[PDB]
């Protein structure tokens, strides 16, 4: 915040550090502060000086319209703090009205992109592309050449992709050529609208005409799968300055590559592998950057995007693992069916992805509303969302949905509360309207064994005793379930209390141990807690559970003729 006074003091001394040391290293401060935006936005007293301090430093830059990318990105973060707080609208609302139109006009280049058909020459503007590694190229004049002709930006992209693959793959050199690519793209106002082909033609290698600009496929090799690590890092720094928007990135890059991933032969099966790598590192030898802020720019830049694309990413991952491949050729020479599944597990092995998806499904179940998935193929899919390192479950029986229920209830704890409850509530809409009876018998036999396993745990602090006694936990999970489920299990809880007296056939030896278990079921307060929530909204469930209260009250009045007053509360609970 107090670099503004330093800028005002050192303006008169007039070194080269004006606009450079207080702005380029300011972005390093910005990158850490953007990455911890949630801590700053939480408390509303320290951050008020931050917007005041950031404004006073760049108070000679409110009226920018053709500035550099680093000048725009800090002012984009100035827009980010202003947008993420309504209380910043009050004190600097007078200096934002002129600031709103000039900043947003750079970002509002939303239009159908230029579909020009210039005959692609692989030699255009060879002066910069001959050796851009040297610092002899002044970078203020390079942006003037790109601004006068849009075709200069196209030819710069075409030949730089030749240099990253043919040349040595050092991680330090590719960072420097990405920095000049990032600053020159954000140097002018409307350079983000011309990216229509390279985001598709780098991956779509089996269309040949639908994308255009065939020099993108021509001058570089496709089968090499080593320089795309540098390419994925290069576009990661490129998107970190908001040079790649997301309003038409789906129309330009994503859905052309989705059809060419799963439904492709070996002509674009390495191209199908290129679909995986550009999206795996988009949100998550190796490109080892020394700057730790550069490894955390993408996590900082992810705050402006939402969960509106991850389910679309994992949609094509399943279909890439669904359409069988045999002509592949063990990382890439094997099939891309299992390699898509490797992407599927490693995405949810990230702890950020698992918590962010489960809170979204708790908000609304429309994240996984796509009917492309089958029954059991979707059932294992959210189990990856439930747990990444889980074993692959067994094959289906006559009741595939019932076996999915029984596995999650054998291992109940507090931490898997919502993902178990999410697994139930997706299953009532995935079951069609002709076969709820199939789901009704699925919740018949799977819930009577819950009643057995609640008895089995009964037969053989608070939180440690809670997780061994998940019948305490399943009743709030039942409480999330709709009223058809509780009405159905009252029939299920009714019939097990009917057979409690009838087992043994009034034996001297066999009935009494079963009747010992029957009054034991009365003794466990889980069983009353299971049914007291169930007494709301039931029309015919009287006769079932009261058969237990028939014979239990009959024996105790004969047992009373025989711990002085322990049975008194045992009689209040039936009242």
């Amino acid at each position: 915040n107090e670099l503004s006074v330093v800028e005002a003091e050192l303006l008169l001394k007039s070194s080269d550090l004006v606009g450079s040391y207080t702005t380029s290293l300011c972005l390093c401060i910005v990158a850490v502060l953007r990455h911890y935006h949630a801590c700053l936005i939480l408390n509303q007293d320290q951050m008020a000086q931050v917007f005041e301090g950031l404004c006073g430093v760049v108070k000679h830059g409110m009226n920018r319209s053709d500035g550099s990318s680093a000048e725009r990105c800090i002012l984009a973060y100035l827009y980010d703090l202003y947008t993420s707080c309504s209380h910043l609208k009050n004190k600097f609302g007078e200096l934002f009205s002129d600031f709103c139109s000039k900043v947003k006009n750079t970002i509002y280049c939303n239009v159908e992109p230029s579909e020009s058909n210039m005959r692609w020459a692989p030699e255009f503007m060879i002066d910069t592309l001959e050796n851009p590694a040297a610092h002899t190229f002044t970078y203020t004049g390079l942006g003037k050449s790109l601004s006068e002709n849009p075709a200069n930006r196209y030819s710069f992209v075409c030949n730089a992709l030749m240099h990253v693959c043919v040349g040595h793959h050092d991680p330090d050199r590719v960072n420097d050529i990405a920095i000049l690519c990032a600053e020159l793209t954000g140097y002018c106002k409307s350079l983000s609208a011309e990216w229509l082909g390279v985001l598709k033609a780098l991956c779509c290698s089996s269309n040949n005409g639908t994308c255009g600009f065939n020099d993108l496929l021509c001058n570089v090799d496709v089968s090499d799968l080593s320089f795309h690590d540098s390419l994925a890092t290069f576009v990661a720094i490129l998107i970190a300055r908001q040079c790649l928007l997301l309003e038409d990135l789906i129309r330009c890059a994503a859905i052309p590559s989705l059809l060419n991933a799963a439904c492709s032969e070996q002509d674009s099966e390495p191209g199908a592998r290129l679909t995986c790598r550009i999206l795996l590192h988009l949100f998550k030898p190796t490109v080892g950057i020394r700057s730790s802020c550069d490894r955390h720019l993408l996590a900082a830049s992810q705050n402006r995007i939402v969960d509106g694309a991850v389910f679309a990413v994992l949609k094509a991952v399943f279909v890439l693992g669904d359409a069988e491949l045999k002509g592949s050729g063990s990382v890439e020479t094997a099939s891309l069916d299992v390699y898509a599944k490797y992407v599927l597990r490693s995405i949810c092995q990230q702890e950020w992805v698992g918590e962010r998806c489960l809170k979204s499904l708790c908000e609304d179940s429309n994240d996984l509303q796509d009917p492309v998935l089958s029954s059991a193929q979707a059932q294992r899919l959210m189990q990856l969302i439930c747990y990444p390192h889980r074993l692959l479950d067994n094959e289906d029986g006559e009741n595939p949905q019932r076996q999915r229920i029984k596995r999650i209830l054998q291992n109940l704890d507090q931490w898997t509360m919502r993902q178990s409850s999410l697994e139930l509530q997706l299953m009532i809409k995935q079951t069609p309207n002709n076969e709820m009876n199939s789901l009704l018998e699925n919740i018949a036999k799977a819930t009577i064994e819950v009643f057995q396993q609640s008895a089995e745990t009964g037969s053989s602090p608070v939180l440690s005793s809670l997780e061994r006694s998940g019948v305490w936990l399943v009743a709030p999970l039942i409480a999330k379930l709709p009223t058809s489920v509780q009405g159905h299990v009252l029939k299920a809880a009714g019939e097990e209390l009917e057979k409690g007296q009838h087992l043994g056939s009034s034996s001297r030896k066999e009935r009494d141990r079963q009747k010992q278990k029957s009054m034991s079921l009365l003794s466990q307060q889980p069983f009353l807690s299971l049914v007291l929530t169930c007494l709301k909204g039931q029309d015919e469930q009287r006769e079932g559970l009261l058969t237990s209260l028939y014979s239990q009250v009959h024996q105790i009045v004969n047992n009373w003729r025989d711990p002085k007053q322990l049975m008194h509360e045992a009689l209040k609970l039936r009242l």
């Binding site: 949630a38 801590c39 939480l42 408390n43 702890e351 950020w352 698992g354 918590e355 931490w415």
Partner: protein
């Protein structure tokens, strides 16, 4: 360990740094006027010595760490990683009664005598309150680790 993000960790310290001193202080001033009952209340004088404050919440958290000092198990490592920063920000915002938070660990440190967890606690808890007082911060760091001057080289 399942859900993470230390934006939650800042909230719980900041949900409770001000609430422990603004709803108990309304009843502390009621206790501050009626705390003079004979020699026993004068011998204690709990309210005028220090305001009444929410305390002894540290004893719910010291039990849940058998050997929580290792990264070899992945789930409990981020449990321990969250544990020390949460203990740090209670001291940073003065969330807890640090007058008695210190004395309990002194009593645990004194009555302690593969190392025991109370030795593992005071070794690895980060206190951000620096240069406050030598009789509270500096002299506490010395006496909690036995006798021996080889620790001064790591100080160097």
């Amino acid at each position: 360990c399942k859900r993470s993000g230390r934006h939650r960790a800042m909230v719980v310290a900041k949900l409770l740094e001000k609430r422990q001193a603004e709803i108990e202080a309304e009843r502390c001033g009621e206790s501050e006027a009626a705390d003079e009952k004979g020699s026993i209340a004068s011998g204690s004088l709990s309210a005028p010595s220090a305001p009444i404050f929410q305390d002894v919440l540290l004893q719910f958290l010291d039990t849940q760490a058998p050997m929580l000092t290792d990264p070899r198990s992945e789930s409990e490592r981020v449990e321990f990683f969250n544990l020390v920063l949460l203990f740090c920000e209670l001291i940073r915002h003065d969330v807890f009664s640090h007058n008695m938070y210190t004395c309990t660990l002194i009593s645990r440190g004194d009555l302690a005598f593969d190392q025991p967890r109370h030795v593992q606690y005071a070794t690895h808890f980060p206190i951000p309150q620096e240069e406050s007082c030598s009789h509270e911060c500096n002299q506490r760091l010395v006496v909690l680790f036995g006798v021996g001057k080889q620790r001064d080289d790591a100080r160097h």
